[PDB]
Amino acid sequence: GVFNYETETTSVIPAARLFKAFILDGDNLFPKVAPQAISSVENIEGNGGPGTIKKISFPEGFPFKYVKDRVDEVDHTNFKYNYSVIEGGPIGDTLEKISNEIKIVATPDGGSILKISNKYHTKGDHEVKAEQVKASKEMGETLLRAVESYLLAHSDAYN
Numbered sequence: 001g002v003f004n005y006e007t008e009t010t011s012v013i014p015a016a017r018l019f020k021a022f023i024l025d026g027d028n029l030f031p032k033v034a035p036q037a038i039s040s041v042e043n044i045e046g047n048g049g050p051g052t053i054k055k056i057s058f059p060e061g062f063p064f065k066y067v068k069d070r071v072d073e074v075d076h077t078n079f080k081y082n083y084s085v086i087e088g089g090p091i092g093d094t095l096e097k098i099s100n101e102i103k104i105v106a107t108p109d110g111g112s113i114l115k116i117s118n119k120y121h122t123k124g125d126h127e128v129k130a131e132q133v134k135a136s137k138e139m140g141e142t143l144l145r146a147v148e149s150y151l152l153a154h155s156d157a158y159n
């Protein structure tokens with residue numbers, strides 16, 4: 001099956017700045033600002049364009065050791081990022097991949113919202129494991145909030 005889980009996260013950070021930092025520079029920021037969520041991010045192949053593979057490692061204790069993610073598309077002006085989880089972590093058993101689409105939109109007050117869709121490709125009619133759905137929500141919050149906090153503490157970053 002293909003099962004879609006969506007999130008709408010409100011952020012006080014303006015959209016262009018948040019896209020530049022959180023989406024396009026998380027390989028740097030995530031291990032820096034959220035080491036208790038992500039221990040390292042390593043480029044595996046590619047230069048950041050479509051088809052680029054990276055390895056995200058998690059600190060010891062988490063159920064998973066790593067995932068490999070693939071960049072699908074980046075739309076720099078519309079603040080849209082498409083990427084897939086293709087190996088490691090939850091990939092195995094009845095789950096083949098997670099296809100993700102993130103879009104950051106400005107809000108009237110000058111902040112932003114992140115529209116997040118995670119589409120899980122599972123075997124047949126097998127559902128996504130509830131623990132995965134939960135862990136994904138937790139990770140997204142930890143990472144976004146940590147980058148937000150960094151941006152608010154460092155006004156000269158990503159202007």
Ligand SMILES: C[C@H]1CS[C@H]2C(=O)c3cnccc3C(=O)[C@H]2C[C@H]1C(=O)O
Nearest residue numbers: 023026027056069070083102116139140
């Ligand atoms: C670097 C790796 C980190 S995990 C993940 C993540 O949890 C997340 C959650 N909510 C919105 C956006 C995102 C992410 O941009 C991605 C980034 C992901 C990747 O680019 O391959």
